[PDB]
Design a binder for this molecule. Sequence first.
Ligand SMILES: [Fe+3]
Ligand SMILES: [Fe+3]
Ligand SMILES: [Fe+3]
Ligand SMILES: [Fe+3]
Lengths: 131, 131, 131, 131
Amino acid sequence: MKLSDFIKTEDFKKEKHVPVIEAPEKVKKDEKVQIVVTVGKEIPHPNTTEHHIRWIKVFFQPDGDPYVYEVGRYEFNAHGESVQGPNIGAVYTEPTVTTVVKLNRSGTIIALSYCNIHGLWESSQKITVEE
Amino acid sequence: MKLSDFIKTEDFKKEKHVPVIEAPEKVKKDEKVQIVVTVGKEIPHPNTTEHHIRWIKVFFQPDGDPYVYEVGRYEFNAHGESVQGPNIGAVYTEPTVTTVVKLNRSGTIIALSYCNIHGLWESSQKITVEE
Amino acid sequence: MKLSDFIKTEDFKKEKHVPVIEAPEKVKKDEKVQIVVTVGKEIPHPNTTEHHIRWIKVFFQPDGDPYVYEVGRYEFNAHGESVQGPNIGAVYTEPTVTTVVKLNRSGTIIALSYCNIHGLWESSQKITVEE
Amino acid sequence: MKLSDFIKTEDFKKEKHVPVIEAPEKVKKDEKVQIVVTVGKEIPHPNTTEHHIRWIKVFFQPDGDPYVYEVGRYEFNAHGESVQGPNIGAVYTEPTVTTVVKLNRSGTIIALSYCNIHGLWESSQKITVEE
Ligand SMILES: [Fe+3]
Ligand SMILES: [Fe+3]
Ligand SMILES: [Fe+3]
Ligand SMILES: [Fe+3]
């Protein structure tokens, strides 16, 4: 068994779990780049104590390199839990994140997200960096 | 020894390590709220393989409640490392994050950040939520 | 507001939430050291979908140094959640961890743990390292 | 591009990066199970400021279920960094972890590990749980 037998892709217009990347197509070398990743972008995903998106992580795959590099892991850790009961707490964290990178070579952005009951999901997008 | 003997505060206008919170003063109940937290906001912080900000986490403290709740942990995991050598890799993750919460009671936002060589730093800001 | 206003200590013989450190009193320089940290050590803590320990992190404070260093963050991420319902899933992760460090100066081990509804808890223990 | 194009397998007797799982073949329902995962098990892996294993995470795949479940993420966050220079700090965290689970159905344990310069690696092992 390989992990990727359990990492799903899909069309975000059909599937709430798909992590959707927003990033520029092309950037200057070393400039700060905003990458937004959102689960439940078009089709909403629940955020209850019982059912919620736990995290998004982002990898960068430089063209011609053997590896990926973990840009970050972004955890969404409040889901309405409380002593007074599930789903009546004060705070919820939505599965939306903006991270900022500086790139100096072209590559591929890969988003991986995790639901507490619906497993792993991915998407990817090329980014071109000026030479 | 208590951990808070090693969590520092300071003025971000004087100290690069202070995590700076940007969030509205007052919000509607259950509405989505953008919280931006940045280290090196006014005074830049390095991002080298040897010296970098590792993470920001955010807590929410509801008024009148005994506890804090971890809103999220946001890791910045690329710092120019590579097989070809430190500081010549393709990607860096800056210590800037935007997270989105839904709040239903007033409280305090607490930001905690960690430098790989300069330890822990904090700041906090009140937020009022419509009743 | 400071975070440490919301980090609690207590006697683990009276309080299930206290993270309990097991580590040797004295070690050789650079030798591998086992550090076990357990919540619910003597008094059990629940592990349900609604109520569970989320993580333990460990810091090391070297004697005479200004800072702490994050040894690790250890997340316990399965709590019986499933599509079929809360508390009938296949897997639970208990809040017990063993991490291995190599130390070259004496210091203090600090454990911090987080419950999804009962906030933050800490404990600490000195460790002496041969010179 | 799929993430699994960049998750490598190998024989731990030939490749230092392989995360090696130690867990019982068969366990009782709901009993506590020790799972040890180690990178550099037989062939050592460096732990320097420039080159180190960042984390191990563990997934559980229940037989007949569509998904994986994140058992935990275990971060190794000290690598000799210090103000005084790289590789002369007081503390290193080795890429060894013991986590404890309670299982109530049979499945597969999947270990995923990440090197700061050599990307992602995996291994897996079946576990049978009494019915
Ligand atoms: Fe889901
Ligand atoms: Fe610093
Ligand atoms: Fe609790
Ligand atoms: Fe490596």
